[PDB]
Structure 1
């Protein structure tokens, strides 16, 4: 079930799949090629199944981080956009769609955390983390908090940790150094120290999660929160005058949040590789192409410099892009699973007073390596099953 003489596209239901098939019907009208967009349940899990048997869609739209596993399984074809078309998108977006120095997907939309604040309580958002403590008691006098965001998630607290020098793995020359962790450098240390300090001073709770944080802002109890474009819909409903802006700066350095980029990948088994490249290069990745998908459903910031500038008219979108530019592309490697979990524990321990800043991060940097075990002994499952899946000759002869 490849396709052959047609195109089949998989994207997530929560996206502008309607907006896409419009560019499908716009393509179909020019080439005579039937484009079918479809959105199956947990496709990001179906794809490793079906593509492994040569079946599945011709292209797949998903976050760039998941493609790492696909590319390593050889499930994605290597794209060949000329230099001219490369200059049409933001250079940083191309670093998000590259596995082993080989380009393996077209960047679509950019997603990053930003600083959301209530314009009523706060006419001017602080440009620095260091003025939050001073700001908090100014607000606490009126029975309001300065800032509240999710602390149970590293994804949310990483921007501050990594603001001074912290980094997952090292990106140098289109390659991630799995042996060059940076959750233990002086940068991370100071980052987390500041965050712990706020909790020790009573400027923040140690048990602030997502729901608590969101609710606090939406009721107008807090002055600021940190969240992405997905939380915008909820605030509009709260009817609370809010603006999204660039994140504050720590020790004069800007915050470095993670960057989730939607990408279009081409099946390595798809016989219509030329057509996919046709569809995506000249039909979708154009002003009207993105416009159309965007109309059914907003995509936040986009990779395409031309259409981005038009969307930038929205202060919120412009801030998401600016935050992403200064941020860090989320590594698509498998060792990333490890990092997440190691850092998660490190922050929670440092928050609860179960460990100290210096100490909990130094346990994490070691703990990350300790998840080399994951790979080894998860392969111990896939290997022992296969040695015994090839000894199926016990059931071949009985039938």
Structure 2
């Protein structure tokens, strides 16, 4: 329940230099008498938000920057306030990756991008194009080898191909309502991947460990991986090169670029020890060297140590691929986007869904929070004030508009028919201000998560929200309505994600209540 005072617990992914990080921990302990424990739990990026929401978890969490906006929005991260002298030691774009709602929410460590890694003894020159890989595989199969193996279980690895011909996550300012997962470009890329599998150039079951072992044993000519993998390749004594990813339809593969970052748990009683560790032990030439020697970091954020490593052709390749890619967003939706696309790739690769079916579901999943919030926020606000929002609905606007019209019909009926239960519960909850609204999340999840799933219960959730919003406006707390709508939306989408996607999201709602 409570994080222990007077020690540091650190979480980092099991593909990174955790033994090197522990060496930096030992240096810290030698100066201070404070013990540093480094752990690498499975699925730590999913475990962290669950444990931290209870006041528990590590003091420090390491992950790429994309997950940290979600954590910060949830109240799970301490604000970082390094002085100017410290801030100036790192590249400004790395600080930009860890800024959320104008606040620094983590320390940046290193820039990561995927590259094409190839065995010079099998393929002296790497392929410039994806399109030439089937013919290379045919050549290599006659030598008892194969052209390419990489992790097909994590969408981070397949994304560069999906993005190449025009797939995108959130259109870039970001337009969060503009998602590019089921467009022609995304379909072309994923169809190419699925055709590789159909034609027996790759196996849908290949994962990180299987691809790594095949490459490092000299069984496959190429893999796709990041700087952290280079240690194990060095140990293997494969004659490898690191290069630009192949093009698709003449266009570069576009890796999603990550900034490995270190956040401090909002519930830690060791925030000063954590800052001291991160600024004066880790983010130093010697600290980063200890970690980099274990598993390479990429292009480190620290100007002084990055200058020394920049002459490495493997780093040059990493940065070439990075320049062709895009820095990941850190918006809270990123977790949902990754879950949606992970499922789409796995299902398309296995034959569970067609490419069209798979990307349609991924588009729905990625759009779900924003579309749900549009509908709910508009209903609550128009209920409270008596007047509709004149602003355009935007992307998938017909669905939003029709869902709002449906909700007007069925939601107004629920508020009439359940006036007695609603008035009774409103009085018992005694909702007075924004603090009271913030306290609703836990109880709403409890009530709504229990029992059957159907559209009627979704209507009850939203309709009581409108009932509360009317109350809030009347008592001059209209500023609480948008936070209420965000809280309800979060409950809805977190608890019913898979069911909602199965219904075709809000189009299911509209069809369910037609006539």
TM-score norm. by structure 2 comes to 0.58
- What CA deviation, in whole Å up to 9, does each residue of 1:30-61 have, x standing for no partner? 99999887889987677657755767765443
Note the alpha carbon deviations across 1:222-271, whole angstroms, 9 max, x for none: 22122334444544454432222221222343222233433222344567
Following TM superposition, by how much is the alpha carbon of 1:107 offset from its aligned partner in structure 2, in angstroms? 0.6
User: Which secondary structure does the structure 1 equivalent of 2:149 belong to?
Assistant: coil
- 1:340-378: per-residue Cα shift (whole Å, max 9, x none)? 3432343345445665545542xx999999999994347
Aligned mates of 1:140, 1:12 — CA distance in 2? 35
Distance 1:189 1:390 in 2: 23
Change (3 A) 1:12 1:372: farther
Contact 1:24–1:35 (CA under 8 A) maintained in structure 2: yes
Task: Extract unaligned runs of 5+ from structure 1.
Answer: none
CA–CA separation in structure 1 for the residues paired with 2:309 and 2:455: 39
Asked if the contact 1:128–1:248 (Cα under 8 Å) also holds between the matched residues in 2, the reply is yes
Conservation of the 8 A alpha-carbon contact between 1:77 and 1:265:
yes
CA distance in 1, matches of 2:69, 2:151: 27
CA–CA distance in structure 2, aligned partners of residues 386 and 183 of structure 1: 17
From the two aligned structures, give the one with the greater helix fraction: 2
Q: Which moved more, 1:32-41 or 1:45-54?
A: 32-41
Count of residue pairs brought into register by the alignment: 393
Structure 1 Cα separation of the partners of residues 52 and 63 of structure 2: 15
How far the C-alpha of 1:4 sits from its partner, in A, is 8.1
Which whole-Å deviations, capped at 9, do the CAs of 1:293-316 have from their partners, x for residues lacking one? 434654344222331232244433
C-alpha deviation, 1:26, in angstroms? 6.7
Sort the Cα spacing of 1:46 and 1:88 in 2 relative to 1 into closer, same or farther, 3 A: same
For the 8 Å contact 1:92–1:325, the answer to whether it is kept is no
Q: TM-score scaled to structure 1, two decimals?
A: 0.71
Per the alignment, residue 125 of structure 1 pairs with 126
Contact 2:231 2:295 (8 Å CA) reproduced: no
Distance 1:376 1:293, change over 3 A: same
Per-residue deviation, residues 157-211 of structure 1 (Å, max 9, x unmatched): 111011232122235xxx7543221112332132223334444555444554445
Please say if residues 227 and 296 of structure 2, whose CA atoms lie closer than 8 Å, have aligned partners that are also in contact: no
* Bigger radius of gyration: 2
Q: Tell me: higher relative CO, structure 1 or 2? Use CA pairs within 8 A at least 6 residues apart.
A: 1
Change (3 A) 1:52 1:148: closer
Question: For the structure 1 residues 13 and 182, does the alpha-carbon distance in structure 2 shift closer, same or farther, using more than 3 Å as the test?
Answer: closer
Query: What is the CA RMSD across the aligned residues, in angstroms?
Result: 8.8
Question: Cα–Cα, structure 1 residues 183 and 39, in superposed 2: closer, same or farther, change >3 Å?
Answer: closer
Aligned CA distance change for structure 1 residues 376 and 266 (closer, same or farther; 3 Å): closer
Structure 1 residues 370 and 209: alpha-carbon distance in aligned structure 2, compared to 1, 3 A threshold: farther
Residue in structure 2 matched with residue 373 of structure 1 by the alignment: 460
Cα distance in structure 2, aligned partners of 1:66 and 1:164: 26
**Matched-pair contact (CA < 8 Å) for 1:335–1:371:** no
Is the Cα contact below 8 Å between 1:3 and 1:58 reproduced in 2? no
Distance 1:327 1:13 in 2: 25
Alpha carbons 2:159, 2:255 under 8 Å: kept: yes
Question: Counterpart of 1:346 in 2: which secondary structure?
Answer: helix
Equivalent residue number for residue 78 of structure 1? 79
Secondary structure, aligned partner of 1:254: coil
* 8 A contact 2:5–2:269 mirrored in 1: yes
